[PDB]
Amino acid sequence: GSHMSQERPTFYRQELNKTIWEVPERYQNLSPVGSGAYGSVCAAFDTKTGHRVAVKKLSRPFQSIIHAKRTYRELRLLKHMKHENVIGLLDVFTPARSLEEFNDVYLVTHLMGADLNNIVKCQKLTDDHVQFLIYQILRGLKYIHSADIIHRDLKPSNLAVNEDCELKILDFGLARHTDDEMTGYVATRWYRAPEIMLNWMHYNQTVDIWSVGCIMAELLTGRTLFPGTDHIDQLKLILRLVGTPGAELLKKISSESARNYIQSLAQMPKMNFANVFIGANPLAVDLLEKMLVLDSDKRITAAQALAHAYFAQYHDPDDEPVADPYDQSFESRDLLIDEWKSLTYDEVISFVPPPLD
């Protein structure tokens, strides 16, 4: 038996954050929470499940061809990610009755309550919290990478945490397929892998591992590991810890006109990690040493990291699932702005509500 017919939900309008929000009657009790450059966010009561959700309104998704393509890609990635430690798409909708009426896009996700920044300011985390937090990031990351995707912007504000210390990776705005000639700018300075900052090489998924290292270091010490004030300070901060790279490694990671500058620097050896993270669990220190290396070919992977002894209390190889490969073929097409928009419209319309369990 098949459905011949579909019933559009009933929508209602109200003013929130200086604009009219128009959402299905399914969502009630909307109130603003978050503000960002691209879309305002409201908490809401999801009458379908009885749980609180975040509703993000996108009003500039197709402003330009660049915006439009990025919106399409991001929605496909969002629709793809189904994993406990990765943000899921509970719903996506538009009030538009047709493609011609289409502009605003609303995304609905779980409302977590805090991000990792919040958590850090409110406590010094125990080694157990750290184990469990980083473990979950890595479990989510193994899944994301197995989809052939690089997150590219892991940082505390992109990590949602609840009261029970459960975590989800947020924000796929900058995420890309590994095989891309990378577009988009990762603006985050403190958590960004050196090879990305140098903008010289086609980098790999281990850029996200670097980020995890910076985050873990920060959870252990209670302060940002590499809080550079600019590109130069950021570099010197990093080389101080990890030691200046051999000449060979240099060739691959920087342009000559950068390579030359680096060499211009006073050379420094790799620091003793135990002294930087004094009183940290020795296993944690060992793992940091495997993450925070300049050579991306030697950097430990997510799947490897999960099997590291530091996670012995949590590691379950039978419960660390992988994804289907993401198909990025449409993103090689050269399309006009309206065509990227029509494609996005298709993705919104074809959205399949997750089952209730």
Short mmCIF file of C-alpha atoms in Angstrom, two decimals:
data_model
loop_
_atom_site.label_atom_id
_atom_site.label_comp_id
_atom_site.label_asym_id
_atom_site.label_seq_id
_atom_site.Cartn_x
_atom_site.Cartn_y
_atom_site.Cartn_z
CA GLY A 1 0.00 0.00 0.00
CA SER A 2 1.13 3.48 -0.99
CA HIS A 3 0.09 7.06 -0.34
CA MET A 4 -1.35 8.88 -3.35
CA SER A 5 -1.77 12.11 -1.48
CA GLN A 6 0.01 14.36 0.99
CA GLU A 7 -1.35 16.95 3.43
CA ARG A 8 0.65 20.16 3.88
CA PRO A 9 0.94 21.04 7.60
CA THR A 10 -0.83 24.17 8.82
CA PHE A 11 1.52 27.08 9.47
CA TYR A 12 1.15 30.06 11.77
CA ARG A 13 2.92 33.42 11.86
CA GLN A 14 4.32 35.45 14.73
CA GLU A 15 7.00 38.05 15.32
CA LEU A 16 10.32 36.88 16.74
CA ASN A 17 13.68 38.64 16.72
CA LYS A 18 12.35 41.49 14.58
CA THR A 19 10.96 39.33 11.78
CA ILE A 20 7.92 37.20 11.07
CA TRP A 21 8.52 33.51 11.77
CA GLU A 22 6.13 31.15 9.98
CA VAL A 23 6.33 27.52 11.14
CA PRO A 24 4.09 24.43 11.27
CA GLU A 25 1.63 24.31 14.16
CA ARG A 26 3.72 21.30 15.28
CA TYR A 27 6.15 23.75 16.94
CA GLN A 28 4.81 25.80 19.85
CA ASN A 29 6.18 28.16 22.51
CA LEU A 30 8.94 29.65 20.34
CA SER A 31 11.46 31.91 22.09
CA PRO A 32 14.78 33.35 20.83
CA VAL A 33 18.01 31.83 22.09
CA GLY A 34 20.89 32.20 19.68
CA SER A 35 22.06 34.94 17.36
CA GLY A 36 24.55 34.55 14.52
CA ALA A 37 25.42 36.19 11.20
CA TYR A 38 23.46 33.76 9.02
CA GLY A 39 20.33 32.74 10.94
CA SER A 40 18.52 33.46 14.17
CA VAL A 41 17.56 30.53 16.35
CA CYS A 42 14.56 29.87 18.57
CA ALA A 43 13.91 27.20 21.16
CA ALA A 44 10.51 25.57 20.69
CA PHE A 45 8.30 22.85 22.13
CA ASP A 46 8.07 20.05 19.55
CA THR A 47 4.53 18.78 20.04
CA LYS A 48 5.37 15.68 17.97
CA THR A 49 7.74 14.24 20.59
CA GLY A 50 7.15 16.54 23.54
CA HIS A 51 10.84 17.56 23.52
CA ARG A 52 12.48 20.99 23.17
CA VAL A 53 14.13 21.68 19.82
CA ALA A 54 16.15 24.46 18.18
CA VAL A 55 14.55 26.06 15.11
CA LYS A 56 16.98 27.95 12.91
CA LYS A 57 15.63 30.34 10.30
CA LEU A 58 17.71 30.89 7.17
CA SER A 59 16.67 34.01 5.27
CA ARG A 60 19.70 34.49 2.99
CA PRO A 61 20.30 30.93 1.77
CA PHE A 62 20.24 31.92 -1.96
CA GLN A 63 21.60 35.46 -1.83
CA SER A 64 24.30 34.65 -4.37
CA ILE A 65 25.45 31.68 -6.37
CA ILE A 66 28.08 31.06 -3.71
CA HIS A 67 25.51 31.17 -0.92
CA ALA A 68 23.08 28.98 -2.89
CA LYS A 69 25.57 26.20 -3.62
CA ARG A 70 26.77 26.22 -0.01
CA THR A 71 23.23 25.99 1.31
CA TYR A 72 22.54 23.00 -0.95
CA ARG A 73 25.68 21.20 0.15
CA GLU A 74 25.10 21.95 3.82
CA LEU A 75 21.54 20.67 3.76
CA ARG A 76 22.64 17.46 2.05
CA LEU A 77 25.33 16.92 4.70
CA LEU A 78 22.87 17.68 7.47
CA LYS A 79 20.40 15.20 5.97
CA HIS A 80 23.23 12.60 5.74
CA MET A 81 24.50 12.68 9.34
CA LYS A 82 22.70 10.14 11.57
CA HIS A 83 24.83 9.41 14.61
CA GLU A 84 24.47 9.88 18.36
CA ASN A 85 27.47 12.23 18.60
CA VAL A 86 26.62 14.33 15.55
CA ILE A 87 23.86 16.88 15.25
CA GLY A 88 20.85 15.42 13.43
CA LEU A 89 18.23 17.08 11.22
CA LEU A 90 14.88 16.51 12.97
CA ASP A 91 12.99 18.55 10.37
CA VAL A 92 13.45 21.01 7.57
CA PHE A 93 10.64 23.12 6.19
CA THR A 94 9.52 26.16 4.26
CA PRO A 95 6.17 28.04 4.31
CA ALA A 96 6.49 28.32 0.53
CA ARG A 97 3.78 26.43 -1.36
CA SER A 98 5.94 26.17 -4.48
CA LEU A 99 9.43 26.71 -5.88
CA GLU A 100 8.36 30.14 -7.12
CA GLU A 101 7.31 31.04 -3.54
CA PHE A 102 10.49 29.61 -2.02
CA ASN A 103 13.19 31.51 -0.10
CA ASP A 104 13.31 30.94 3.64
CA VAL A 105 14.60 27.66 4.98
CA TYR A 106 14.05 26.51 8.59
CA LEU A 107 16.16 23.71 10.11
CA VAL A 108 15.09 21.84 13.21
CA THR A 109 17.58 20.07 15.50
CA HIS A 110 17.81 18.85 19.07
CA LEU A 111 18.28 21.63 21.61
CA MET A 112 21.28 20.60 23.69
CA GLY A 113 21.52 23.38 26.27
CA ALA A 114 25.18 24.30 26.53
CA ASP A 115 28.25 24.24 24.35
CA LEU A 116 31.72 23.12 25.45
CA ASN A 117 32.79 26.74 26.13
CA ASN A 118 30.03 27.00 28.75
CA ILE A 119 31.14 23.81 30.38
CA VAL A 120 34.76 24.89 30.61
CA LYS A 121 33.97 28.22 32.36
CA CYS A 122 31.67 26.53 34.87
CA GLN A 123 34.16 23.85 36.01
CA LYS A 124 37.57 22.31 36.01
CA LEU A 125 36.67 18.98 34.39
CA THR A 126 37.83 15.70 35.96
CA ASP A 127 39.93 13.29 33.92
CA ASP A 128 36.79 11.17 33.60
CA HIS A 129 34.82 14.03 32.05
CA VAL A 130 37.70 14.68 29.67
CA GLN A 131 37.90 10.99 28.71
CA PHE A 132 34.16 10.88 28.04
CA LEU A 133 33.99 14.21 26.20
CA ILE A 134 36.91 13.59 23.87
CA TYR A 135 35.80 9.98 23.37
CA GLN A 136 32.42 11.15 22.07
CA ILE A 137 33.96 13.74 19.79
CA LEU A 138 36.18 11.02 18.35
CA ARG A 139 33.31 8.55 18.01
CA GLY A 140 31.37 11.20 16.08
CA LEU A 141 34.44 12.10 14.05
CA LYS A 142 35.06 8.49 13.05
CA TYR A 143 31.55 8.52 11.61
CA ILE A 144 31.91 11.86 9.80
CA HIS A 145 35.27 10.88 8.27
CA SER A 146 33.94 7.50 7.18
CA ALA A 147 31.47 9.51 5.11
CA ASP A 148 34.48 11.03 3.31
CA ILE A 149 33.80 14.38 4.97
CA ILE A 150 36.10 16.84 6.74
CA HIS A 151 34.39 18.97 9.39
CA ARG A 152 37.09 21.65 9.13
CA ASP A 153 35.90 23.70 12.11
CA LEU A 154 35.85 21.71 15.33
CA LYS A 155 36.04 24.04 18.33
CA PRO A 156 34.23 24.28 21.69
CA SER A 157 31.39 26.46 20.38
CA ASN A 158 30.67 23.73 17.78
CA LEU A 159 30.30 21.07 20.41
CA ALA A 160 26.97 20.73 22.20
CA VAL A 161 26.89 19.25 25.72
CA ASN A 162 24.05 18.40 28.10
CA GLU A 163 23.87 17.99 31.90
CA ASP A 164 24.80 14.32 31.60
CA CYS A 165 27.96 15.24 29.72
CA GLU A 166 26.61 13.80 26.47
CA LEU A 167 27.96 15.54 23.38
CA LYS A 168 27.14 16.19 19.72
CA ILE A 169 29.27 17.77 17.00
CA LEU A 170 27.57 20.82 15.53
CA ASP A 171 27.69 22.89 12.37
CA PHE A 172 28.36 21.56 8.87
CA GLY A 173 28.56 24.97 7.23
CA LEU A 174 32.30 24.55 6.50
CA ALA A 175 32.29 20.76 6.08
CA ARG A 176 33.52 19.42 2.69
CA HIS A 177 34.11 16.16 0.85
CA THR A 178 37.78 15.13 1.20
CA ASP A 179 38.40 15.17 -2.57
CA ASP A 180 37.35 18.82 -3.01
CA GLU A 181 39.65 21.53 -4.14
CA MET A 182 38.66 23.25 -0.90
CA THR A 183 36.49 26.39 -0.97
CA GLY A 184 35.20 28.40 1.98
CA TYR A 185 37.33 30.11 4.62
CA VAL A 186 37.88 28.58 8.04
CA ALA A 187 38.07 31.76 10.17
CA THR A 188 38.76 29.98 13.46
CA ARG A 189 42.31 30.72 14.47
CA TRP A 190 43.03 28.89 17.71
CA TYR A 191 41.84 25.38 16.81
CA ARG A 192 42.76 25.36 13.13
CA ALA A 193 45.42 22.96 11.80
CA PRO A 194 48.72 24.61 10.74
CA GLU A 195 48.44 23.23 7.20
CA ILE A 196 45.05 24.95 6.79
CA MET A 197 46.38 28.26 8.05
CA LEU A 198 49.31 28.10 5.61
CA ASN A 199 46.80 27.74 2.77
CA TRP A 200 49.38 25.89 0.68
CA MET A 201 48.39 22.23 0.53
CA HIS A 202 45.32 20.15 -0.18
CA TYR A 203 44.86 18.96 3.41
CA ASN A 204 43.27 15.76 4.79
CA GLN A 205 40.79 14.68 7.46
CA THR A 206 43.48 14.81 10.17
CA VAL A 207 43.02 18.56 10.27
CA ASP A 208 40.04 17.70 12.49
CA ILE A 209 42.33 15.59 14.70
CA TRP A 210 44.57 18.60 15.28
CA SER A 211 41.48 20.52 16.39
CA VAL A 212 40.55 17.72 18.77
CA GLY A 213 44.06 17.90 20.24
CA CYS A 214 43.74 21.66 20.85
CA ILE A 215 40.35 21.10 22.48
CA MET A 216 41.52 18.26 24.75
CA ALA A 217 44.61 20.19 25.79
CA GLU A 218 42.29 23.05 26.74
CA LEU A 219 39.93 20.76 28.73
CA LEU A 220 42.95 19.45 30.67
CA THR A 221 44.68 22.75 31.49
CA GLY A 222 41.68 25.08 31.58
CA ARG A 223 43.22 27.51 29.07
CA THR A 224 43.42 27.80 25.26
CA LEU A 225 46.52 25.95 24.06
CA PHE A 226 47.42 28.19 21.12
CA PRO A 227 45.67 31.54 21.60
CA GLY A 228 47.43 33.38 18.75
CA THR A 229 46.66 37.06 18.29
CA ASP A 230 47.46 36.77 14.58
CA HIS A 231 48.95 34.42 12.01
CA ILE A 232 52.53 34.90 13.23
CA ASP A 233 51.83 34.58 16.96
CA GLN A 234 49.73 31.48 16.21
CA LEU A 235 52.59 29.85 14.33
CA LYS A 236 55.22 30.64 16.99
CA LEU A 237 52.87 29.34 19.69
CA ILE A 238 52.61 26.03 17.81
CA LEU A 239 56.31 25.63 16.92
CA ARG A 240 57.19 26.35 20.54
CA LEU A 241 55.34 23.22 21.60
CA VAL A 242 55.95 20.91 18.66
CA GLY A 243 59.33 21.97 17.52
CA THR A 244 60.24 23.50 14.18
CA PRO A 245 59.72 21.07 11.29
CA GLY A 246 62.46 19.43 9.23
CA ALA A 247 63.15 21.01 5.85
CA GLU A 248 61.44 18.19 3.93
CA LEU A 249 58.16 18.63 5.76
CA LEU A 250 58.41 22.38 5.12
CA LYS A 251 58.30 22.00 1.34
CA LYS A 252 54.88 20.38 1.39
CA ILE A 253 53.07 22.52 3.98
CA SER A 254 54.02 26.09 3.02
CA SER A 255 54.72 28.25 -0.03
CA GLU A 256 58.33 29.27 -0.64
CA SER A 257 57.39 32.78 0.48
CA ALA A 258 56.25 31.22 3.76
CA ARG A 259 58.83 28.47 4.03
CA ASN A 260 61.44 31.22 3.82
CA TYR A 261 59.87 33.09 6.71
CA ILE A 262 59.53 30.01 8.90
CA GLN A 263 63.21 29.16 8.42
CA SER A 264 63.86 32.80 9.27
CA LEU A 265 62.58 31.92 12.74
CA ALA A 266 64.82 30.69 15.51
CA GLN A 267 64.61 26.90 15.53
CA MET A 268 63.11 25.15 18.55
CA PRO A 269 62.92 21.49 19.55
CA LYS A 270 59.76 19.62 20.48
CA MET A 271 58.84 20.40 24.07
CA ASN A 272 58.34 17.91 26.88
CA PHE A 273 54.56 17.41 26.85
CA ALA A 274 54.51 16.11 30.43
CA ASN A 275 55.71 19.50 31.69
CA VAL A 276 53.06 21.43 29.78
CA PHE A 277 50.24 19.18 31.02
CA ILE A 278 51.57 18.50 34.50
CA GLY A 279 49.29 16.33 36.60
CA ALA A 280 47.37 15.19 33.55
CA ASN A 281 46.78 11.48 33.09
CA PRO A 282 49.91 10.03 31.42
CA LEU A 283 47.71 8.29 28.80
CA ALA A 284 46.10 11.61 27.94
CA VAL A 285 49.51 13.19 27.48
CA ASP A 286 50.58 10.33 25.20
CA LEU A 287 47.46 10.77 23.04
CA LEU A 288 47.99 14.53 22.73
CA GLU A 289 51.52 13.76 21.50
CA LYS A 290 49.97 11.62 18.77
CA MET A 291 47.45 14.33 17.75
CA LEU A 292 49.52 17.50 17.90
CA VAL A 293 52.13 16.71 15.24
CA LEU A 294 52.85 18.87 12.25
CA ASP A 295 53.12 16.02 9.78
CA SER A 296 49.57 15.21 8.80
CA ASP A 297 50.74 11.90 7.42
CA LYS A 298 51.86 10.85 10.92
CA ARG A 299 48.91 12.31 12.83
CA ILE A 300 46.72 9.70 14.57
CA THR A 301 43.28 9.12 13.01
CA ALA A 302 39.87 9.08 14.72
CA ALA A 303 39.54 5.29 14.47
CA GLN A 304 43.07 4.85 15.77
CA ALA A 305 42.52 7.35 18.60
CA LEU A 306 39.40 5.49 19.82
CA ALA A 307 41.53 2.39 20.38
CA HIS A 308 44.10 4.36 22.40
CA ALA A 309 44.40 3.19 26.03
CA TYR A 310 43.17 6.54 27.39
CA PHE A 311 39.67 5.51 26.25
CA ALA A 312 39.83 2.01 27.70
CA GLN A 313 36.80 2.69 29.94
CA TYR A 314 34.58 3.76 27.04
CA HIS A 315 35.94 2.14 23.87
CA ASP A 316 33.56 -0.35 22.26
CA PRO A 317 34.58 -1.32 18.70
CA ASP A 318 31.17 -2.94 18.21
CA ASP A 319 29.44 0.33 19.06
CA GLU A 320 31.39 2.89 17.05
CA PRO A 321 29.42 2.87 13.77
CA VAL A 322 30.40 4.26 10.39
CA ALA A 323 28.51 6.10 7.65
CA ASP A 324 27.69 5.54 4.02
CA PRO A 325 29.98 7.43 1.66
CA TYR A 326 28.53 10.82 0.83
CA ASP A 327 27.79 11.37 -2.89
CA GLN A 328 29.07 14.82 -3.89
CA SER A 329 28.61 14.47 -7.65
CA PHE A 330 26.05 17.29 -8.12
CA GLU A 331 28.53 19.75 -6.56
CA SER A 332 30.84 19.44 -9.56
CA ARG A 333 28.13 20.83 -11.85
CA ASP A 334 28.28 24.45 -12.95
CA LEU A 335 24.84 25.78 -12.14
CA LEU A 336 23.07 29.10 -11.98
CA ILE A 337 21.78 30.49 -8.73
CA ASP A 338 18.18 29.43 -9.38
CA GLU A 339 19.35 25.95 -10.22
CA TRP A 340 21.18 25.51 -6.90
CA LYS A 341 17.99 26.87 -5.33
CA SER A 342 15.73 24.39 -7.13
CA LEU A 343 18.02 21.56 -5.97
CA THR A 344 17.78 22.77 -2.38
CA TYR A 345 14.01 22.96 -2.74
CA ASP A 346 14.05 19.30 -3.85
CA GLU A 347 16.03 18.34 -0.73
CA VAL A 348 13.61 20.14 1.59
CA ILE A 349 10.60 18.49 -0.06
CA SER A 350 12.08 14.99 -0.10
CA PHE A 351 12.99 15.20 3.60
CA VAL A 352 12.04 11.99 5.46
CA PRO A 353 10.95 12.50 9.09
CA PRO A 354 13.04 10.35 11.41
CA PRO A 355 10.90 7.61 12.97
CA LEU A 356 9.61 7.84 16.52
CA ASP A 357 11.14 5.01 18.57
#
